[PDB]
Write a protein that binds this ligand. Structure first.
Ligand SMILES: Nc1ncnc2c1ncn2[C@@H]1O[C@H](COP(=O)(O)OP(=O)(O)OC[C@H]2O[C@H](O)[C@H](O)[C@@H]2O)[C@@H](O)[C@H]1O
Ligand SMILES: [Ca+2]
Ligand SMILES: [Ca+2]
Length: 336
């Protein structure tokens, strides 16, 4: 709530992401279902996962250098994994961390590029952690630049890093405050259409047999879905995905945010807009921790800290450190 890029929006953003990670992790890889479960939330018994672990490292690097520093951030990613390897990291990305831990590795972008036979990862790990980029940078141009660079430390495929940019742009727009769902989507579609005109993105999509301009095509499908009668969970998953690939989860999280901007008679009205967004996201199944962490980052930025329920927040491991980091970003980079 309040002004664009307010303290409340910064706090709400990281808290919403933490809630999505911790609450979503219950159902990892799997709606009356979910409603029963969240009743348990009415201390810090819900562990966070790699989503939050990497988001913390990304934010701590930004705060330490008051800028993006690829060497500092890569080493904080690698040291965070060394300290706590069991947070549920992707099977592939652990190879990047182990190469970065070698002090002879002096070009910190090359391990990511070697992944998957030199094509790079298209997993959603670059996007799951990216919200802090949009807290640190107000400009659309800087958000894209550093969403891409931060993502490329582990995700060198355009499918991976453009998913991170798209998620960062969504958080960026949510921090600006009230919007129609149609305007919000149209802004994202315009940005992705511009990025997916790049020859590198066209090649990656072609070689995987995908639609030309894959994120753009899925954002167009979101627009159609938002106009469709009686949309079911199966239909959402069939059109957008609920998977570990960035292209099968970042649009899905954005859809969850946009859909839940209005009340849903199937979710009890006692839940606020942030809560109903998280509940709806988790009800899609699949990679629930990451889809919920990304939808929650967007919704938290949009609705603000006043919609973060204390009962839910205080169930989450590290919620106080998360909140302090949000306040530090607002001080150091928003210069409040
Ligand atoms: N180019 C590719 N070709 C084939 N498979 C791939 C490719 N890229 C990714 N994969 C598959 O995608 C997997 C993960 O890619 P990873 O780069 O390890 O890590 P992440 O951080 O993105 O993890 C993605 C999510 O998975 C968990 O839920 C985590 O919590 C994340 O939310 C690989 O092991 C491959 O099977
Ligand atoms: Ca996770
Ligand atoms: Ca995940």
């Amino acid at each position: 709530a309040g002004a664009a890029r307010s303290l409340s929006r910064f706090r709400g953003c990281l808290a919403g992401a933490l809630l999505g990670d911790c609450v979503g992790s219950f159902y990892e890889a799997h709606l009356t279902s979910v409603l029963r479960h969240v009743q348990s939330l009415e201390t810090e018994a819900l562990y966070y996962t790699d989503d939050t672990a990497m988001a913390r490292a990304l934010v701590q690097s930004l705060l330490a250098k008051e800028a993006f520093d690829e060497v500092d951030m890569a080493h904080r990613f690698a040291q965070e994994y060394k300290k706590d390897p069991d947070r549920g990291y992707g099977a592939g990305v652990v190879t990047v961390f182990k190469k970065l831990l070698n002090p002879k590795c002096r070009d910190v972008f090359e391990p990511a590029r070697a992944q998957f036979n030199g094509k790079g990862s298209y997993g959603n790990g670059g996007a799951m952690r990216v919200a802090g980029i949009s807290l640190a940078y107000s400009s659309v141009q800087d958000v894209q630049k550093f969403a891409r660079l931060s993502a490329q430390l582990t995700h060198a495929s355009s499918l991976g890093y453009n998913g991170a940019i798209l998620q960062a742009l969504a958080v960026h727009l949510a921090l600006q405050g009230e919007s129609s769902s149609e305007h919000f989507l149209k802004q994202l579609l315009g940005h992705m259409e511009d990025l997916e005109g790049d020859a590198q993105s066209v090649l990656d999509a072609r070689e995987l047999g995908m639609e030309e301009r894959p994120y753009s095509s899925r954002l167009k499908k979101i627009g159609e879905l938002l106009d469709q009668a009686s949309v079911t969970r199966e239909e959402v998953v069939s059109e957008l995905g609920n998977g570990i690939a960035a292209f099968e989860s970042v649009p899905t999280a954005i859809y969850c945010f946009l859909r839940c901007m209005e009340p849903d008679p199937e979710i009890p009205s006692a839940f606020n807009s942030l809560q109903r967004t998280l509940i709806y996201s988790i009800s899609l199944g699949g990679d629930t921790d990451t889809i919920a962490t990304m939808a929650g980052a967007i919704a938290g930025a949009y609705y603000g800290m006043d919609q973060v329920p204390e009962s839910w927040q205080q169930s989450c491991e590290g919620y106080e450190e998360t909140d302090i980091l949000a306040q530090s970003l607002h001080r150091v980079f928003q210069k409040s």
